[PDB]
Amino acid sequence: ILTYLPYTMLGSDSKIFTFSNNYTRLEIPKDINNSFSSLLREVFEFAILYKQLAIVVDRYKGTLVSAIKTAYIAILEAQLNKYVNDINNIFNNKPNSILVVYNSIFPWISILRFLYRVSNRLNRLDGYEFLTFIYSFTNHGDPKIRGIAVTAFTEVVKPYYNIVEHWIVKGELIDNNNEFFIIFDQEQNEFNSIIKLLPKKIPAFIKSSDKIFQIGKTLIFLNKYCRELKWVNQYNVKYSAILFNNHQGLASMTTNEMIKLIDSQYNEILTFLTQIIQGNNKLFTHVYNFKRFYFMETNDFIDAIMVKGKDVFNESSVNISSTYLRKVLQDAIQISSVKNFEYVDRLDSRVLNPQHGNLGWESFTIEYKIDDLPMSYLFEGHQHLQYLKMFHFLWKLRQLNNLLNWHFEMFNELNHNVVTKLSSRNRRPLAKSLSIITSIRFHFTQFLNELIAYLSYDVIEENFQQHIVRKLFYNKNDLLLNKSFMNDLPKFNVNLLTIDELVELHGTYIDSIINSSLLNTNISYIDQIFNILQTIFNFINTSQEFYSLVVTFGLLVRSDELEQDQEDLEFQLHKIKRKIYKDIYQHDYKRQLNDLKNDLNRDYNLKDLSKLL
Amino acid sequence: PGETITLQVGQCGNQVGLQYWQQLATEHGIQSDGSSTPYPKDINDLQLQELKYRNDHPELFFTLSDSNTYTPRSILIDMEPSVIAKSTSALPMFNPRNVHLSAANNWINGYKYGTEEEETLLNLIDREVDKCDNLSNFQLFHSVAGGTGSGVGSKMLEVISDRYGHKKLLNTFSIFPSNVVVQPYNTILTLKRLIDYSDATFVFHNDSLNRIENFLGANKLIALVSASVSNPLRFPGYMYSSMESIVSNLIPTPDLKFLTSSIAPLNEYDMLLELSNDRYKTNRVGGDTSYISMLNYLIGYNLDQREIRKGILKSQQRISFVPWVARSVLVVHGKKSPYLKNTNLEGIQVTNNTSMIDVFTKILKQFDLLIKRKAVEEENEVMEMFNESRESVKSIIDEYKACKEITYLD
Amino acid sequence: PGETITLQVGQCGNQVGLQYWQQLATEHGIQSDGSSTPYPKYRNDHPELFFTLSDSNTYTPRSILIDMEPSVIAKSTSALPMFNPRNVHLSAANNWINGYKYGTEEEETLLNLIDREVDKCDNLSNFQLFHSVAGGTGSGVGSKMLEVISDRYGHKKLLNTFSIFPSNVVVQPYNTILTLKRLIDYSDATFVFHNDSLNRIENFLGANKLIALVSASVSNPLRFPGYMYSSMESIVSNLIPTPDLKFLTSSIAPLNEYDMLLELSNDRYKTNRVGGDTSYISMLNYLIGYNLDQREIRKGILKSQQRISFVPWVARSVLVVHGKKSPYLKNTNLEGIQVTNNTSMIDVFTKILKQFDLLIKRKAVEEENEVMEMFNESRESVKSIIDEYKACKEITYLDD
Amino acid sequence: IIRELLFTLLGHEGHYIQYSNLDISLKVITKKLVKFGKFYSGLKSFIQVFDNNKFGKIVQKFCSEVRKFLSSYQQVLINVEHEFKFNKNFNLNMLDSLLHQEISNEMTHLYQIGIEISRITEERNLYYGKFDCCKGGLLLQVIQERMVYYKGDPTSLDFLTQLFDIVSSDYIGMLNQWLLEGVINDPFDEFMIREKWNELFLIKIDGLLNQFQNSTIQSKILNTGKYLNIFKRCTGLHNFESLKEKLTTITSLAAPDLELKIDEFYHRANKMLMKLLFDGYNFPSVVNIFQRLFLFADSFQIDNFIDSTFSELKRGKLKISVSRLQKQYDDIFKEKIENKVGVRPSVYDVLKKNQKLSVTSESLYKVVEELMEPTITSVDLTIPLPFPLNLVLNQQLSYQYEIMFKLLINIKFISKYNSSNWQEMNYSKIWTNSHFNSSVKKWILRCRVLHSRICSFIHELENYIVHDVIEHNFEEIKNLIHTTATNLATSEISTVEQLIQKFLDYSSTLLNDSLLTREESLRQLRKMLDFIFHFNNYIVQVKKVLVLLNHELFNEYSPMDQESIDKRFANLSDTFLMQYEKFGENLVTFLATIKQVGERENQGLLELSNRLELCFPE
């Protein structure tokens, strides 16, 4: 009978039409014959596809799911509510045979086959494999397939774009469903382990994919680290109003309206980011002042702490570094030219690692205290431990240079006050002896003064102009365009750039100094210099026992003898093995000319250094 | 970073020292009144262009007061009061208490006047030490012959040693006379005290001075070199912060303390090769003289790295070096003063060479030629000071003659 | 190329140099106040070869204005107030004898004057001399002026002259034979201009502008850059094949580029006296009136190859020089200046020999016996250049 | 007898005839009836397999059209069901005429077009054919096969042109977006133009129609979108829309308006690109700068470089350093300017700080030799020419435009040596003494005349090169640039494809007329310029031989007074006579080589042969 056919289309058991729970066919024999049931098979498939799909919306009717899939269930229920509306009027009018009901439902099998194939792919890996599955059908032929694909996509993208619009006008994240690509790593160390982009979670419908990353990240940096709670409130009240009041949401916006909005919003924040790093934070003024203290660009200050601190630095690390190093730092500021310039309160000093207790000359350092100054500015440890190691290497060179010129000032008065007035006959073995010690100082003060002159101008000063000054105030490679050709955004000479590029210009500027040519079959080049500096450290330490003997040599000739001739010959014997010991450390510096020149010629970078070091 | 006291003695050092202090005034912004000029911003740091706070260090040569006046720490001493009035009235910022007034045409009259008023000269120097917080360098400006600066200037360099223990660096900045009856034996008497109570000497020939610039023009040429060696001191850079760091990098032996200077007059590649020419040296050169040490100043600001390095490598082959000295040509990249114009580029080379053989033997050849031709108990002390000065200048002559041959290794 | 310095000697040279520098200032748009005019930096013309660049943007020409009398100097400074007041030098000279003594005692102060003009140029390439070959103040010190600059600089700096020969005082045959000796062994290039023939071209002020037209058109590719003839050394190297016949003449054209090359070769438009049968050695044509259609120039050169007389040992070539017009001046028409050296300079030299040999036969302390020696040495100095012109014309040149 | 065949045409059983008979009566009319309904399920089986995401997008729209016919098929089965139960009393006669009048006209054509796709599925200006899965190209071309096979039927072709209209409606939408805008949006490989500026737009010759086969129309559709991307890569402007509209052709891929609208989109893609090159990047300001740097329009810059580096250019490549020659070239040509952010350098001061003067080890007389089948010879220039000016003035142009620079700087160096040798052969002190013998004075006078004819050779060869060749051919290029530029400013030559051809023709004739194309022509140009250079350096070494032939000059400049003076003068006249007969040797063959190639190929080269043959015999 024909009236039992609408009873099966809604999934109800009659006296002869029976089925099972799931995944079974409507095997109904004995109606007329196989001639009537064979055509009845393909319309029986219309009924099993309704019941198998109705149990999917029933078991997931807004429950057991907290994701984007709860909006697709509202899509699945809307077409299912329109399906049962079509069975009612097609059976309201009286049908003659079961062929006329097959004709009106035949435009609906195209819609029903698509909803089942996407519902079968549920409770599988249901992250981005479902949102991209619907978008993979939005560009297709067969407009009944394309018609159901767009109406199932425009109302499933609204929960996804709700994460995007909060990422544009507010600068936060409301994500909980293993979704939108800006994830927060739990290791909150610096502003690099925090927000990062994964390229694999980039969808095929987001056209920008890189400006929305650099709009939400700088909004967090302009809200919590550099708070400024006046511009962000004006930014949130303006652009969220023009996104909601006239375009009713971001999903209603087309592709051209999104790129026009985001690009006009991407350069709006970077104008404000480059506003407060330069006009208020003074990034370049502090990077140049970072060089005056960590890279020894003002040698008058480093010479002052080595003169006004020659008593504290001789002791061990038992110094308090609260009233001792504060006293030495503040009086040396009055000595040198640091007492007049602006940022003198930012200058502080400390002792590094007092638990070692090696010496006081080694543990000292200088610190540029960048407190506030609302900028981090990604100047974390790996940007600072290599930035304090370079100071301590440059501290070893200025230390030896301040006890080699005092060695010149100490031996000239030793010659004058003593040696020129020694009996008029013992001067000739002594004036010959002291001319070797003053001359071996000259071989040492020329090796350091050209080693610093290579580091301070070829390595330090040339990389600062190339990496810091050129990338900030000069143009890139990078153009030529007469703008008069077609139809409150202040543009300035900073070459506007983001967070990930401000850390890289300063990160490479330190990386291109500490790792450039020689600062890292043989030992390393930095280890070869430390062996030569150890000899100069040992040459001056063995020169004071020479200086303390000659002042006693003058005391023997003033007041005068058989026992005196024994005592004089033992004292001149102290001078014989001493100048021989001075020849030992001379050939070790002559050994420096052998191994360094055999290593500098292997590189084109250090070929010029092979003739002036 | 101790300050530097300058001593101007003699008729030369007063007019040369006037050009030395007028050069330091315009370089540091201070005027003849003494008031300070606001410091211009250096172009090493630019601001957000829409489209007090000093980087130099003038305290080493000037003192500070409450009303921000800068007074130079110079001591003026002469016989005639006319030469002091032309120096004080030209630059009114000189301290009038440093002015001393007494003529002497001989070294004996100059050294005897240095003995009679020891107390008023030693007290005048010690008042300037009370002004500074740290003292590390004394400076002189005296004539080797001619005026009274040879006689009483020879005594003023001796009272530094007995009072302070000779721990202060003495730079003499001597001006040797041109090619006069008093001139031969005036030179040989002050040079014995010059090589005994000093630490460094920058020689300047007057007869070779007019060859460079082609008496007021001769005074401006000495002050250009004398203020150039203090350019990394006043304007702090990476190296050469103190005067002991420059000189000890230049003088290998305490008997070798004689330095020859040269002015370069463009780019900075030809500027390094122009300084190596023998015609620009203030000291006269004869044959090919081997160089011991050299320091090239580029005090006009040079943003020309990798171009200075090519000039240093080229100036190593064209200069013959002493065998026991390593071939190292050192150059300082001095910074331009922001008060002076940035258009000009200066260049100075101070160096130690063997060219002082011809200078000292020129005096010793004329020394014995006059004392044999022309020649109360005053003749005995004069004669023994001649023979003491004769054998003492020979000691640095044979030290230079033995310097060319490979020695000082036994 | 190289920068250019000129020397104006004598009363006649100062009047020519007044018109020569007013025409050079007109072509580059330089006003008569030392002020520059914007182009109608970014300049294609090069006035730096003749004028000095200063910090205050004033334009001063590189000229020396030596003269005996202060009358014409006030004419040049008032009409053209941009000359350097240190370069001009002042103190009557009617003969060569009293005029040569002015330059001998003042040689040091005048040699020091021109050393101020060498260091202002980066690379100097040539000298110039505007004077009169007959005259006391011009030929007197100017003969010493070209001698002191010949041995000091020593063959590396070229020395061109633009002299004016007498057309007709009775002392004028005395000095024209003396200075013609010094113009032969000490000058590199020499231009001949006749005061009588210049009046025929226009149909003393009218003849000055015609010399200023030729003396400024010869350096038109020197200042205004082009494809060729960028330097003066490449211009004179065509016209002078051997140094013993360096005397040069010129021609002025005043409408087609084919007809302009035919009107320049006529003997009517000449600055020098032309005899009956003259044979040319080398020719240079200056088409400075913006000739662009190079189809009529090709016919004018090919017509001038087999029409004009030629010297047998030299290669007959008619070099045409395309000159760009000055943008500051208006385009009037095509301008042509033909400079060449020919055999037509015998008739004026033997005319000077005729007035000299007739005067010695007529005879019109310690100063007499020396000037007869100087009259003798200057006679076979210019008689050897006559036999040089007579030898190159015939076949007797190409043998022993 | 009728109800069982009512279900058989629906692809189902009728219990007597066949699957999804032996009682054959006079029922002849049902012999063809069950054959018509047999392949009904062939359409329905075609839908379920070819509607997948693969097999291209153009078969999906066709899969919608056959399914629309499946509903129009079942629409007439209600009428025969109404014909069955009612009292018709007309059986076995009219059943054939009803179901084939409006169905069989479309049922037959829809099956042959579907069975051919399954047949070709079992088989599986530019390049990269080898199409896969017979998606878009093979389906669209067999439809046009179906129309021409049934010519002569008005009632059959009208359905095929409507089937080709709606099926190919999706293919026009990407073709209209390529020609108008330049978007190549195609998720599959379902287009002609495949984005992979030379090997990037392969045209996929496997799947074109018969209309898109002409070699002239393949470039009209390929360069329309390529020249639009250049306007889209430079100034930005994704999806221009230019405050305007366009006709936006819609009708079909079979119309007389197809060949007209493709050319209409081709003129708009060239009008907008040429407006970017001429007005935006200042292309007239580039061709006047290439004349000032390669062909010496203003030789004041290069003449100051040659005389300053005159001693460096005479020596070989081994006795000179590369850095000394390049550095002097920068101070005289370039100008160091600061790239402060805010200023905008034009095309004049960008190409002026871009050239490089390399002296790498080849020769001028072998670069031209390898093109076809001293340091002044190997000096050259190179300009990077940034985007998008590297597209029209390509590398084929600049290689034929740099060769002229090495030739123009070689003869300007010979003209510099001869102009300097004239200075020392005429007004020196060593060369011109006063009282030496007449046997030597005849040798000096014979050396000056030979050099005065050598110097006039290069001053005549240059007057043909720099004026008759370079300047004359540039007057027609410069004329058709400014009067192109006056027409472009009005609209918001007329083709970029002919602008490259017009400049390649300019550089070729400059290379052709300047004696650098033929074998015997280059063999004499190398021999002639080398002999002049071998005579120029011969002059400077006689200056030390003339000091021993005069006794007065050697006394001032310090084997004398023997027969060796006459011996070395005899050796001087021997090596001078060998160069005089050698000058006449190569010149009469150089005059013969221009007469050979000046009559058959180049009429402009004969003008030199008319001018130079009348000079030197005279």
Side-chain angles (χ1 to χ4, degrees), chain B residues 317-328:
Chain B
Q317 293 106 26
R318 68 169 51 234
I319 290 192
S320 168
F321 275 102
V322 175
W324 54 271
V325 184
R327 332 186 85 206
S328 294

Side-chain angles (χ1 to χ4, degrees), chain C residues 103-234:
Chain C
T104 315
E105 302 133 8
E106 287 154 70
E107 174 274 348
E108 180 74 283
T109 184
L110 281 165
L111 190 55
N112 185 275
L113 187 51
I114 73 160
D115 306 315
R116 292 183 182 272
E117 296 312 288
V118 186
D119 55 320
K120 287 167 190 173
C121 315
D122 305 359
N123 196 359
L124 194 149
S125 171
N126 49 358
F127 276 86
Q128 290 187 10
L129 198 79
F130 288 93
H131 70 115
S132 86
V133 79
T137 177
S139 154
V141 59
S143 199
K144 192 45 191 182
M145 266 302 111
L146 55 89
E147 164 57 12
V148 60
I149 67 181
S150 312
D151 54 347
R152 176 153 147 79
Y153 298 111
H155 97 277
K156 269 301 152 189
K157 316 298 176 177
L158 191 86
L159 172 56
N160 312 269
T161 79
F162 299 94
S163 44
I164 309 193
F165 275 74
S167 69
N168 285 127
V169 74
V170 299
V171 79
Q172 64 89 28
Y174 276 104
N175 44 6
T176 178
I177 179 64
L178 291 162
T179 181
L180 262 173
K181 171 194 167 70
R182 277 94 192 178
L183 283 187
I184 280 169
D185 48 2
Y186 288 131
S187 157
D188 284 340
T190 303
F191 276 63
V192 191
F193 296 110
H194 273 200
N195 195 31
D196 57 62
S197 278
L198 278 156
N199 295 134
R200 192 162 281 100
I201 305 305
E202 191 50 281
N203 302 285
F204 194 75
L205 176 48
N208 273 56
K209 298 159 69 169
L210 288 188
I211 310 172
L213 270 185
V214 181
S215 45
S217 281
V218 62
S219 42
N220 208 3
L222 181 69
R223 316 181 311 267
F224 288 89
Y227 276 85
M228 213 197 304
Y229 308 106
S230 50
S231 64
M232 186 77 105
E233 274 305 320
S234 315

Side-chain angles (χ1 to χ4, degrees), chain C residues 249-262:
Chain C
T249 181
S250 69
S251 183
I252 316 181
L255 75 161
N256 212 356
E257 307 141 8
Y258 165 67
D259 282 277
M260 198 69 59
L261 297 188
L262 295 198

Side-chain angles (χ1 to χ4, degrees), chain C residues 197 267 270 272-276 278 280 342 344 347:
Chain C
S197 278
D267 47 356
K270 288 283 189 202
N272 196 19
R273 182 71 176 87
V274 188
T278 80
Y280 291 77
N342 46 5
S344 162
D347 51 6

Side-chain angles (χ1 to χ4, degrees), chain A residues 115-152:
Chain A
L115 292 176
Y116 174 71
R117 292 314 296 242
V118 297
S119 278
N120 192 286
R121 293 166 191 258
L122 274 195
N123 322 296
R124 212 174 287 273
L125 269 65
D126 279 14
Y128 274 147
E129 278 83 330
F130 195 83
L131 190 58
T132 43
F133 210 77
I134 303 296
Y135 186 73
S136 165
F137 281 98
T138 200
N139 48 4
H140 204 243
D142 204 346
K144 309 272 289 178
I145 302 293
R146 197 265 308 275
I148 195 55
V150 292
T151 183

